[PDB]
Structure formats: C-alpha cells, structure tokens
Design a protein around this ligand. Sequence first.
Ligand code: CLA
Ligand code: CLA
Ligand code: CLA
Ligand code: CLA
Ligand code: CLA
Ligand SMILES: CC1=C(/C=C/C(C)=C/C=C/C(C)=C/C=C/C=C(C)/C=C/C=C(C)/C=C/C2=C(C)CCCC2(C)C)C(C)(C)CCC1
Ligand SMILES: CC1=C(C/C=C(\C)CCC[C@H](C)CCC[C@H](C)CCCC(C)C)C(=O)c2ccccc2C1=O
Ligand SMILES: CC1=C(C/C=C(\C)CCC[C@H](C)CCC[C@H](C)CCCC(C)C)C(=O)c2ccccc2C1=O
Ligand code: SF4
Lengths: 33, 734, 48, 80, 153, 42, 98, 107, 67
Amino acid sequence: TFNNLPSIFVPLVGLVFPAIAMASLFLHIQKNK
Amino acid sequence: MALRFPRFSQGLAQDPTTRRIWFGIATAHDFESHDDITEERLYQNIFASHFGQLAIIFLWTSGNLFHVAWQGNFETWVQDPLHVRPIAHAIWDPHFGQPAVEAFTRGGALGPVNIAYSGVYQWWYTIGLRTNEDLYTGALFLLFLSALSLIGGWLHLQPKWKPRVSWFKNAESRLNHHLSGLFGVSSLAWTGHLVHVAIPASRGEYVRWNNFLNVLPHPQGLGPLFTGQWNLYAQNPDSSSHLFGTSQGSGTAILTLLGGFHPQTQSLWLTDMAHHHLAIAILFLIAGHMYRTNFGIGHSIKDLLEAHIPPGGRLGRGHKGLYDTINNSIHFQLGLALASLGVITSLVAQHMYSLPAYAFIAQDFTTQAALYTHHQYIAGFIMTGAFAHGAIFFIRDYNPEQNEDNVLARMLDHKEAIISHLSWASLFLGFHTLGLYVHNDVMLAFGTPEKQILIEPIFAQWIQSAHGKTSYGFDVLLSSTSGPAFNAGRSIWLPGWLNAINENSNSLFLTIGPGDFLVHHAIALGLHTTTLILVKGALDARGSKLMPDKKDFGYSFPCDGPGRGGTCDISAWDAFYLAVFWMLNTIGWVTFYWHWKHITLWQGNVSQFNESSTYLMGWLRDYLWLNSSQLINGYNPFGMNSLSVWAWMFLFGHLVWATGFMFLISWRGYWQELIETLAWAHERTPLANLIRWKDKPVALSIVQARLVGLAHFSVGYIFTYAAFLIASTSGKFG
Amino acid sequence: TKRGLLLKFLILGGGSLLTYVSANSTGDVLPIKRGPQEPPKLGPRGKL
Amino acid sequence: SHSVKIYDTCIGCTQCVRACPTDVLEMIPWDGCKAKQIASAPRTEDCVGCKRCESACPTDFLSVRVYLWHETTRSMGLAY
Amino acid sequence: DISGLTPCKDSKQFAKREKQQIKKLESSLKLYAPESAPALALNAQIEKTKRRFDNYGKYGLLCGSDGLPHLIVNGDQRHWGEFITPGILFLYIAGWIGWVGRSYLIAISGEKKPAMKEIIIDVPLASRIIFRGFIWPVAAYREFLNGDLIAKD
Amino acid sequence: MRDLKTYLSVAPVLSTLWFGSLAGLLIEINRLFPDALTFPFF
Amino acid sequence: LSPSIVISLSTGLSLFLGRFVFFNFQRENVAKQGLPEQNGKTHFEAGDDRAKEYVSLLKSNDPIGFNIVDVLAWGSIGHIVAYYILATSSNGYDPSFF
Amino acid sequence: WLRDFLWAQASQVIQSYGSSLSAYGLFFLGAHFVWAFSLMFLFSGRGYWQELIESIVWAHNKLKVAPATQPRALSIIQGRAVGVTHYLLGGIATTWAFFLARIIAVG
Amino acid sequence: PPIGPKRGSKVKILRRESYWFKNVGSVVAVDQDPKTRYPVVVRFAKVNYANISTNNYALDEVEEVAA
Ligand code: CLA
Ligand code: CLA
Ligand code: CLA
Ligand code: CLA
Ligand code: CLA
Ligand SMILES: CC1=C(/C=C/C(C)=C/C=C/C(C)=C/C=C/C=C(C)/C=C/C=C(C)/C=C/C2=C(C)CCCC2(C)C)C(C)(C)CCC1
Ligand SMILES: CC1=C(C/C=C(\C)CCC[C@H](C)CCC[C@H](C)CCCC(C)C)C(=O)c2ccccc2C1=O
Ligand SMILES: CC1=C(C/C=C(\C)CCC[C@H](C)CCC[C@H](C)CCCC(C)C)C(=O)c2ccccc2C1=O
Ligand code: SF4
C-alpha cells in the first residue's frame, strides 16, 4: 500500500492539518491571559 | 510581554480591530521593533531564526530528493537522459477528471506526474547519485541536517549556550572562518566529491561510501600532490568522445583545465569543475587567514577602514568610523549581504545558461528557462531587499554624529546629485530606447522596415570578439591568433573555449544584433530606474524638504497627511514598494529577452528574433501571441492536454495580478465606509445578531494594502510568466 | 456538549473518516485512483 | 493611543485647535511667541490621526506633529 | 564590412526587400486606372521607395543577414554620418534650447513676481534671448570658465 | 491689439504656435528629404 | 631540484625573511592595527569570553620575539611558494608569446 | 475569452502592419502603453514624486535654471484623475484598435 | 539695542528642518522680547509646500548673508 499513501497524506495535509492549524491559530488569535 | 496574539507587541495586542491579526503576522520577524527587546536578545533570535531557515532548506531539499526517489523516473532518466522526461513528483488531486489523469501521465509512470523543470535530475546525475537509493540516502541525510539545525537553534536559545552580543559582533573571526572554512573548506570538500565520486561516476564506476576508501581517484594517488607534480592530474582529459556515465572514451585526469564544453552533454567538464573548486578553495583558505582573531597576526577591519582616508579629502573623512556603523547595525550587514547575493544570483543565472555545469541541462530547454527566470527574479527581489534594508539602516541604525563627514554621510550630503543623475540616466534611456522602439514600430507599421534605427551593439560584439567569437571580423585579443592572449592560453583552455564559443548552437556568447542593443538599453533603463527609486528612498529615508522628520516616523508609515500639498507614498517603504513594480518590469524585460532569444535559437530561426526584436509588435506578435498558443490551448472545449495546468496557472496569475490593482488603485476610506455598512447589516440581520465578531472588522491599513496589492501583483506576475515560459518551452521543446 | 472533547473528537474523527474513505475509494468514485487507463503518449522531441 | 507632540516653533495662531475634530488640542498660556499662547495636547487618547492639525500649521515645516501609534477604537474612527 | 555586415548596395536581402515592397505597391497599383490620382500617388511612393533604397545604398549603410540598414555608432569615420554628425547636430540644437530657456530664466529671475513671466512669455525678451543661443557653445564654455554656469548657493 | 498679445504670450497659446511652426518645419523637411537615416552632407 | 629541496629552501627563505627582514614591519603594523575594536572596546573587553588573544601560544622565547604563529605564517607562505614553484615547473606549459 | 476571443480575434491587429490597418496596429500598442502609463499614477502617491522633483529642483538650482513656477508633484486627486484618465484612454483605445482592425479585416 | 538683524536685512537659514534650508530670505521683523524663542520673521520669495512664504526663525537658526 504505497500508491495509497498519497490518498492518506494529501487530505491529511491539505484538509485536516489546515483545519487543525486554522482552529488552533484562531484560538491563539482570540486568547486573553 | 503582552496579552493577545501579538505577544511580541503590546500595541497590536491592545488593538480591538482586525488590524491586530494582520500586523502581528507581518511584524513577527521584525525583532528590532518588539517590546522589551535588547541587542542581545535580537541577535539571539536572529541566530535561532537562521537555524530555522537552514532546517527548512535542508527539509525542502530532502523533500525534493524523496519525491524524485519515490515518485520519480530518475533510474530511467540516467539511461537515456536527453530523451526521457524528468518527474518532479506524483500528483493525487481528487478533483482530477479521467482525461486529466490520462494527460498528466508522463515519463513512463504508473500514474499522473509532474515534469521536473527544476534541473535537480541533471544536477544530481552530474554529481553522482545514480540509483534512487542514493537519493533516498540523501533525503535521509538532509532530514538529519534539518533536525541538526533545529537542535542548534533550540540549543542556542537556552541560557547555557545563548551567545553574547559581543560574539555576533566578532566581525574578524567570522570572516576568517567563513572565508577559510565555509567558503574554502567547502569548495575543497566539493572538489573531494567531484574527484572521488562525480568523475568516477561520469567515467563508469560507482564510488560510494562502502568502497571509497579502497579506490584511487587517480591511479598514482597523492604522489603528484605531495611531490608537486600536479600536471599528472591532467594527463588523460577524456578527449572529445567520452560518453557520460560509461567508461567509453573516459580518462584518468581529475583537475585538467580544458575550457569549453563536453561534446556529448554540452556541459562543463567535471575535471574542470573539480580543478575550479580546488583553486577557489586555495584562494578562500588563503583569504581567510587575513583578519586578526586571537593569535597576534592579521588585520583589524577597523584600522583598515580608519586608515583608508585619502589625503586631500576628496572623499572627506573616508571610512573613519564605518566599522561601527556595520558591526553594530544588522541592517547595513543585511543590505550589503543581499547586494552581494543579488549580484551573484544574477551571475548564477547568467553563467548557468551560457556555461551549464550539469549533464544534459542545455538539452532540456524548459529547465534552462525556468532556472534563469527563477534566479533572475530572485536576484531582482534580493537586490530590492538589499536597498530596502539600506533604507531601514539609514532610518533605524544610522548615527550621523558617530560618522560625521565620512564616506557614508557624504551620501546624504549630495543625495540630490545621485538621485538627479540617476533620474537623468533612466530618463535618457527610457526616452531614447522607447523612441527607437516606437520608430521601428512605426516603420514596420508603414511597411518600411529599412527605415528602422538598428544600432548594432559594436561594443558587445567587440567583447565577444575579444573572447574568440569569429562572427564579426574584429580580430581582437582572442579572435586574433597573433596576440599575447592567444599565445599564453592557446595551450591550456583556449582550444576548448574557442570550439565552444564558435558553436552557434549553444548559449555561450550568443550572436547578438540591434534588437539585443535595444533590449539591453531597456534593461539598463530598468536597472537605473529601480536603482533610482530605491536609492532615492534610501537617501530620503531620514528626511527630505517635504518631510525632514521622516526618521521619527520609522521605515513603514502610510503618509504625512494631505497637508503640504499631499504626502502619499512618501515613506522609504513606499519607494521600495514602487521599486518592486519597476523591478518586476526589469526582470520581465530581461527574461522576455532571454526566453525569446533562446526559443528562437532552439527552434532554429535566430533570424526571427534578429528581424523581430527591434519593434515591439514583434515582441507582442512573434513572442507573446505566437508562443502562447499551445499554452492557452491547454484546455479547449474539445479536450485538454498536459499544459492544462499551465493554462490554469496563467489565468490564475492574471487574476491575482489584476486583484493587486484593487488594493493599489482603490485605496482605503472607500472600504472602511463599506465595512461600516456591512457591520450595520450584520448587527441588524436576524439570526446573525447571535454571531458577533471579537475583532472589529476594519478595512486594511494603507501601507498594508500597498503590500497586499504588491503581493497579489508579484504573485500574478511570477505565476503568469512561469506558466507561459514553461508551457511554451514544454509544448514544443525547441 | 464538552467543547474541549468535541473539538478533539471532530478533528480526530473527521481526519480519520477523510483519510479512510479516500484510501478505500475504488476506481469508480474518483478517477485519480484509477490510473491512466490509456497508453502513455510520447512527449515532444522524442520525449524531451 | 496616538502621540500628538507639539514643538516650541508654534506661534499661537489657534488653527490646529480650530481644525481638530476631536478636541485633542487646546491653547494654553505661554511665553515663547508674539501671541503668548501655545497649543497643548491633553486628549491624545481621542486622536483619530486625521492630521488636520498639521495641515493648518503655518510654520516652516510644522509645530504640531502627529506620530501615528497604537490604534484603539477611538483612534480607528469606529462608530461600532 | 565592420561587425560582419555586408554593405547595403551589395546586400542581396536589401535588394530583395526593395523588390518585395515595390511589388507590394504595384499589386495595389493595378486596382486603379493608370492616369488616376491614387495611381499617381502610388507611383510617387514607388519612386520614393526606389530612391530611398538607392540612397541607403550610396550612403554607406551596412545591412545584416535580415537585410536592413544597421547603424555603426562606435566612432568609425565611414559611419560618423550615422550617429556623430547627427549627434553633434542634436547637441547643438538641444543646447540651443537649454541655453535659451536657461538664459530667459536668468533674464526674468530678477523680477518682482517672476512666475507670471513663466506662464506669460515675454515675446520681445524671448526673441532677444533666442538667438543668443545660436553660438551657445562659446557662451556655455566661457560661463563654465567664469563660474557663471553653476550657482554658488 | 492690447491684451491679445498677452494672451498669445501665454504658455499654451505660445506653445501651440511654436510647435505648429516647428511641426510644419519638420513635416516639410521630411517632404523635401524623406526617408533619412544618415547625414551625408558632412 | 628535488621537491624536498624546493620545499625546504623556500620555507627556510620565507621564515628567514620573517625572522630577520620582514619582522619589524609586520610587528609594527600589528601594533598599529592592534586589535579588532568593537565600539571602542576590543572583542574580549566588550565580552564574548572567547576572543581573548592567546598568550600561552605567543609567549615563546626568542631575542627578537618570534612566536609559533609567525612560524606558521612564514612557512605557510613557504610551503605555498614552494608548491607554486613545483607545480609551475612540473607543468610543461608554453607561454609562446613569441 | 483569452483564447478564442482575445488571442484569436487579435490576429488582424498584429497582421495589420503594412495594410491600411497599421495605424490600428500602432494604436493597439500605444493604447496598451498609456493604460500601463496610468498605472504610474494610480499605484503611486504625490510624496515620492515631490521628493524626486525636489532632487531635480536641486539639479536645476545648480545651473541657474531654477523655475519661478515652483515644480510641485500632482495633487493627490490629480494623480488619481490622471491615472483613471490614462487608464480609460489606454484600455478603450486598445479595445478600439482591436475592434476596428479585426472587423475591418474580416467583415 | 535692537537685537538680531534689521527689518530689511537679507538673511539665510541654517535650520535643517526648514523648506528654505540654505536659501536666502528677507527679515520682516525681529521680536525684541528676550523670551520669544523664534523672533526673526523671515520672508522668502518662493513658497513652501504649504503655500506659505514666511516663518519665524531663531537667531542661531539664521545667518546674515554678505550680499
Ligand atoms: C478547485 C481547484 C483545485 C483544487 C482545490 C486543487 C487541489 C489540489 N491540487 Mg490541483 N489542479 C487543479 C485544480 C485544483 N486542485 C486544476 C484545474 C489543475 C489543472 C489540471 C490542477 C493541477 C494540479 C497539479 C499538477 C498538482 C495539483 C495538486 C493538488 C493538491 C495539492 C496538495 C496539497 O494540498 O498540498 C498542500 C498545499 C499547498 C502547500 C499549497 C497551499 C499554499 C498556501 C496557500 C500558502 C501558504 C500560506 C500560509 C503559510 C499557511 C496558511 C494556512 C495554515 C493555516 C496551514 C490538492 C489536492 C498537486 C498534487 O496532488 O500533488 C500532491 C499537483 O502536483 N493540482
Ligand atoms: C569554519 C567555521 C565556520 C563555518 C563552517 C560556519 C558556517 C556557517 N555559519 Mg558561522 N561562525 C563561525 C565559524 C563558522 N561558521 C564563527 C567562528 C563565528 C563566530 C564569530 C560564527 C558566527 C556565525 C553567525 C553569527 C551566524 C553564522 C552562520 C553560519 C551559517 C551560514 C548560513 C549558510 O548556510 O550559508 C551558506 C552559504 C555558503 C556556503 C556560501 C555559498 C556562496 C557561493 C559563492 C554561492 C555559489 C556556489 C553555490 C554554493 C553552488 C550551488 C550549487 C548547488 C549545490 C545548489 C553556516 C552554517 C549564520 C547562520 O545561518 O546561523 C545558523 C549566522 O547567523 N555563523
Ligand atoms: C508604461 C508604463 C510606464 C512608463 C512609461 C513609465 C515611465 C517612467 N517611470 Mg515608471 N512606473 C510605472 C509604469 C511606467 N513608468 C508603474 C506601473 C509604476 C509603479 C507605481 C512606476 C513607478 C515609478 C517610480 C517609482 C519611478 C518611475 C520613474 C519613471 C520615469 C523613468 C525615466 C524614464 O524612462 O523616462 C523617459 C520617459 C518616458 C519613458 C516617458 C514616455 C512618454 C514619452 C517619451 C513622452 C512624449 C509622449 C507624447 C509626445 C506626449 C504627447 C501627449 C499629450 C500631450 C497629448 C518615466 C517617466 C522614475 C522617475 O520618474 O524618475 C525619473 C521613478 O522614480 N516610475
Ligand atoms: C488541498 C486539499 C484538498 C483535498 C485533498 C480535497 C479533496 C476533495 N475535494 Mg476539494 N477543495 C479544496 C481542497 C481540497 N479538496 C479547496 C481549497 C477548495 C476550494 C476551491 C475545494 C473545493 C471543492 C469543491 C467545490 C468540491 C471538492 C470536492 C472534493 C472531494 C473530491 C470529489 C470526489 O471525487 O470525491 C467524491 C466524494 C464525496 C462526494 C464524499 C465526500 C467525503 C467527505 C469529504 C468525508 C467527510 C470527512 C470529514 C468528516 C470532514 C472533514 C474534516 C476536516 C477535519 C478536514 C475530495 C474529498 C468535491 C466534493 O466531494 O464535495 C464535497 C466538491 O464538490 N473540493
Ligand atoms: C528618440 C528616438 C528617435 C530617433 C533617434 C529618431 C530618428 C529618426 N526618425 Mg524617428 N520616430 C521616433 C523617435 C525617433 N526617431 C518616434 C517616437 C516616432 C513616432 C512619433 C518616430 C516616427 C518617425 C517617422 C514616421 C519618420 C521618422 C524619421 C526619422 C529620421 C528623421 C529624418 C528627419 O526628418 O530629420 C531631418 C533633420 C531635421 C528635421 C532637423 C532639422 C533642424 C533644423 C533645420 C535646424 C538645423 C540647422 C541649424 C541652424 C544648424 C546649422 C549649423 C550652422 C550653419 C549654424 C531619423 C532617423 C523619418 C525618416 O526618414 O525615417 C527614417 C520618418 O519618416 N521617425
Ligand atoms: C541603500 C544602502 C545600502 C544598500 C545598497 C545597495 C543594495 C547597493 C548595491 C550595490 C551593487 C549591487 C553593486 C554592484 C557593483 C558591481 C561592480 C562595482 C562591478 C565591478 C566589476 C569589475 C571591476 C569588473 C572587472 C572585470 C571584468 C570587466 C570582467 C572580467 C574580470 C575583470 C575582473 C577584469 C547599504 C546597505 C550598502 C548601505 C546603506 C545605503
Ligand atoms: C479590496 C480591498 C479591501 C477589502 C479587504 C478586506 C477588508 C480584507 C480581505 C477580506 C478577507 C479577509 C479575505 C482574506 C483572503 C486570504 C484568504 C487571506 C490570506 C491571509 C492568510 C495567509 C493568513 C480593503 O480593506 C482595502 C484597504 C485599503 C486599500 C485598499 C483596500 C482594498 O483594495
Ligand atoms: C508620475 C507621477 C507624478 C509626476 C508627474 C508630473 C509632475 C506631472 C507631469 C508634468 C509635465 C511633464 C510637465 C511639463 C509640461 C510643461 C507644460 C512644459 C512644456 C515645455 C516642454 C516640455 C514642451 C505625480 O506628481 C503623482 C502624484 C500623485 C500620484 C501619482 C503621481 C505620478 O504617477
Ligand atoms: S496650528 Fe501650529 S502654529 Fe497654530 S496654534 Fe496649532 S501648533 Fe501653534
């Protein structure tokens, strides 16, 4: 399963990691200590 | 330090608006302007950031190596290189339709793939690196170097290893080590690679890490070097019949100075490059041991600058006090650094096409165009940054009382003369270059091309004839056999150099004509005008008659209000911002000239360029309209081809190049008074009063919007021309 | 209801379902996982 | 918020204050000019930054001088 | 024969360009009556073309492989007429203009409101000043030696 | 005519007169000596 | 001339120039430049705790003051000029001006 | 639109050179220019040009050729006016040359 | 004694931050109060960017020209 690895990582970097980063950085943007 | 996201700045953290987000993104790497900053902490953040950049560089190179090793046809490319397409990386786009999968399947691949127009195939094949396991090993090693640079950048932020401010200001030991080791020992080690590996790899045998301690790069082995008989390293130069990658016609020499190109690859000899890197290694290792560090010998750069005051005072106080305005000022260091880097990047671009070092890189035409365009746009940007950081130095770091009457204050003493004579040279060049181009446009329009003003570039043809080009009949130092230059070098390198330059098919000192004159003067106009804008913003960075207190406003500020007639775009930042436009124009000219001259050379009809480069409808018809057919037909209604992505990127670059015009033409005030209506509507729309912003949505700031328009503009410029230059050069390939 | 346990759940569930349904997607839903399904044509100038 | 610092080249013409749409400026007594008054700036926290004060300052360059700085909701001209 | 360029009276591509343009004009000449006015204008253009190519032949112009007159601006005497003899004829005339408009600006520099003579040009004063720039080079030379060319601030 | 010579002395009227005369001069020169690319008179 | 003879003679004639001929000039130029000055102070005086001019390596005895660093310097010049001689002689290159 | 309209129909305006429509060819490019010439005005601001002008005014004071009508950069509103003016002129004249060359050379 | 230049004396400017820096002007009036910091009112032939031809200058920000 090595021709299937692009199918794993292109969503995981391009859809999932952007959701993670956008959510985390939006929380960091609006935080207040 | 602060509370909200710009922790480095409690002025943006205490900003209720959305400007907080943007400006905290932008000013993140401006450590000099952060809160609670010291020179020590500034230097340490710079050092750790340099480590991070080196880590990202090695990671990006490891990614190239991995995606050529995993998804590349590199093992097939090293068999028949000049008739097998490189493969950058695979593609898994779930939006692709089946025709686009049928179309993007290239290079004999199991699926759709992207063609490496970057030249990493040719370069890696030239330095050894035959099988894909070698590229895998290289990617592993560069991942290791990325982790090493990250480790170093974290380690040199801890207190036990945080270096001191006076350690980054050791401007003699650093030059000593970087010349001797970073420049000299590294060139020496690259000679070691070229001798132990790349020359044996070009001549058959694969000397790898397991069997490099028991093979001889030269059959004698260190007898010639230690005994001084260095000519023994130039005995069998694998003359005129060597097949790259096989032992047929190979040789034993490792440092022979031959000059000119390989006959097969039309690249330079690996023996030539080995001897080259060896020679500059000796020169840099010698030049390293110059600056005094710890040992009681060497120069102090202070007492070289302090001592270079001419009697008579034509300069003034000379360089008296200039060690302190560079050692204590990181923006002077950065400006000089980017100046040198832009000069040598342009040099890289100008020499890699005419003296290609890699095997079969002159034979793939899209690669050379992509590389020249890349390094020249990079060089123009790096040059613009050199000047921008000189302006930032003049504002932030320049101390006039410390450098009174020296060679640097004398810039500001007569800055009007510099700016006005640059404004003369650029104005002359534009008036006359455009006048001649328009004269020729009208002559071709009126059907009388014989009336054109075709000024031959005699002064460049004379230099070409001073290098052995026997295409003009000037009979100069190297075109004349009876000369001192064609006698002291006729036994060493002039045979190969003459037989390379006289070949009309390669890029070495192309046969030029009047179109080349005219476009060289357009190039001079671009360089002089970008220089004018940048120098004017650097010297008027501290102040002018319209705003003498500009230094108090910083580098980037919007304006000084409508008063005093109007002060739009008065900052030195704004000068930079306009100079990026003129820079992109200049590099567009140099690269249009390059790409059309070369695509006409590669096609065969140099006469096309020579008769069509003298009038601008020849550039619009025979270059932009003609070569963009196969591009814009990348996707037609009845099908698509492999250039569909370049057509889409072409139109994308058009779209963002046009979107930058929104931010450049349309300015603020209209948008704040629009977003006020939008905020009203959101606060009075039912089921959306529930949702309310936390950051008050203001329009973009002024200087920010100039930046954003410039970013859209440059992204579109670059993407459009990349798409056109790759699609046209890959739709036909010469 | 628990937000900190809903954000984590949505992240690690959406990413899981996305990296799963893309992996086990046969060559009938999306064509990128089919392949060329055609003889690869030669490029210009032989192939270069 | 902003920083409206003025300088001693002011002549006491009271135009910077008569242009100010936010009452940042106010004339005080002073002894450095023929008019015997100078334009202070107490309410700098109300400054929008419009620089009407220095588009009305009849000096060789300027006496009132607006240095744009940390932008608050009062300095970003926000009615919302 | 400098810069690898055959002369234009000897260049076959130059004569081919002449013949091509002449045939292009004659193909437009057939559509009109031989005594008509468009036909006579086309014939005048034909003789203009022919004597233009003859004059580029006789004046030492050099033609390239494309077959177009190239200008050798380096300094060879044979081609001074291409750049230097016109160029001096420019720098004279141009230096006339600047020596006039400068001198005028010095003659209206000592007025009360000297800006209302910039937009309303004193034609008598300008006509007196215009021919001062006829032999401008000696005036500029001497004013450079006398220091009157550069203001002393 | 008084104050008409001041109007004709104004920069645009004077510029159009000067450039009309100059353009007619250049135009009639190019009629007399058309298609010029060298100065052969020495 | 054998290469050992060339190396030995050129090195000897280099540190002979360094010991006797070009000593007072080199040392007076050293004292003239003195040290790299970072903002008036030296590199070690301003801090950094690593740019201290080593004296345990420069204290070596000689009536004129020759140290091991000058032995390396005159002697690096020596081996360099020697290898220039050797390679330039071993390369049968014809300048062929005439 | 880029291919079948702008690239395709703008063949007669580039082949216009020679036949009567050479002016439409010329007015293509010049219009293409003036539009771009406008971008000098819309993108920029009066402050840079006033400072460039004051450097040039220094160069003129150094030759006793200082004007009495003091050179000032265009008003901000006037820079915007010149910009939109040249922009409309160049774009509209480009389209005019394109249209008339195409349609006179095909119909 | 009247301080400064006279009410018709020609003067030049040594103020770095002025529009008329190293440019001559005509002294309109000098305020004789020894408490005004900038008494020397100067009149210049050419306006600044604010369309203003005059400003008060100091005594040490001024230099009595020898013409
Ligand atoms: C709807 C349009 C669309 C979209 C969404 C995509 C989507 C994609 N295409 Mg594209 N493509 C399209 C149309 C489209 N395609 C068309 C019409 C063509 C022409 C036929 C192509 C031709 C094409 C090729 C030839 C290739 C792709 C590839 C890809 C994939 C990129 C892999 C990735 O996510 O890496 C991560 C994405 C990036 C690094 C790019 C984003 C860069 C950002 C904006 C800049 C950084 C901003 C900042 C630092 C970070 C902020 C975000 C942060 C919160 C994380 C992705 C699935 C590639 C692929 O599948 O290889 C793996 C590839 O090689 N496409
Ligand atoms: C000999 C010892 C030595 C060596 C090897 C280095 C090496 C380095 N130092 Mg230095 N350093 C030293 C001693 C040394 N240092 C000492 C003693 C001090 C204290 C005074 C410092 C203080 C210091 C600071 C303060 C910093 C460094 C930095 C760096 C890095 C430079 C960035 C880089 O990658 O440039 C690479 C550039 C080159 C190799 C030059 C190449 C230019 C040529 C002309 C270009 C053309 C050929 C091209 C290479 C061919 C490309 C073809 C193909 C392969 C692509 C590099 C790792 C910087 C850094 O990054 O920190 C991590 C930094 O900030 N050092
Ligand atoms: C096609 C567009 C274009 C053109 C022609 C120019 C032209 C010029 N720019 Mg650039 N500029 C442009 C776009 C353009 N710019 C853009 C898009 C930007 C980004 C904002 C800039 C930013 C910029 C800066 C920041 C600077 C310049 C400068 C200059 C001048 C450079 C000197 C020169 O070549 O003068 C030669 C003259 C020309 C090329 C003018 C062409 C017009 C002809 C020759 C005049 C005669 C035409 C005709 C007879 C008039 C009749 C018409 C009417 C009366 C009916 C010149 C006026 C520099 C400058 O002005 O200093 C000298 C400078 O500092 N420009
Ligand atoms: C760069 C990364 C990237 C990647 C990997 C994808 C991947 C995909 N996109 Mg694309 N997209 C992207 C960027 C990307 N997109 C961007 C930047 C844009 C804006 C231009 C778009 C705009 C776009 C549109 C407009 C559409 C897609 C569609 C699709 C799907 C392919 C259609 C198909 O044949 O499957 C068919 C498969 C299905 C119909 C089933 C969908 C399965 C879903 C996605 C699983 C749910 C996962 C999870 C719970 C939610 C995400 C969690 C989060 C953490 C990421 C595929 C999942 C199409 C689609 O499917 O629409 C939903 C579609 O219509 N995309
Ligand atoms: C700046 C660039 C440039 C240059 C160098 C030229 C140069 C030329 N053009 Mg081109 N042209 C340009 C821009 C340029 N043009 C532009 C921008 C356009 C579009 C508007 C044109 C459109 C164009 C056309 C359509 C034509 C030309 C022509 C010409 C030629 C002019 C022949 C002529 O009538 O002069 C003759 C000399 C004069 C008019 C000067 C006379 C000056 C007076 C009489 C005073 C001199 C005497 C004085 C008292 C001193 C005597 C000395 C002493 C006794 C006192 C010449 C080669 C013509 C030609 O022949 O084609 C080659 C032609 O037909 N040009
Ligand atoms: C603003 C500023 C800045 C920046 C600037 C810049 C960016 C500059 C650049 C510059 C540049 C970018 C330059 C370049 C130059 C070049 C040169 C100067 C050249 C020379 C050459 C030569 C001399 C040559 C010779 C030769 C030849 C000809 C060839 C062969 C060989 C030989 C050697 C013979 C700074 C920071 C500084 C400071 C502050 C201010
Ligand atoms: C269009 C426009 C706007 C409207 C711009 C709005 C307010 C901002 C952009 C709207 C949203 C936020 C689009 C964001 C697009 C990108 C996805 C953001 C990229 C940033 C990430 C890399 C972080 C201005 O506010 C403006 C202000 C001054 C001069 C010119 C202009 C101007 O031309
Ligand atoms: C180029 C430019 C300028 C400089 C433009 C100048 C100052 C205006 C052009 C003036 C012409 C060239 C003056 C000369 C015409 C005279 C009537 C003299 C005639 C005499 C001979 C020249 C014929 C600005 O002032 C400006 C201001 C605000 C935003 C953008 C810009 C902008 O882009
Ligand atoms: S406008 Fe200027 S001079 Fe007038 S009162 Fe205000 S600060 Fe003083």
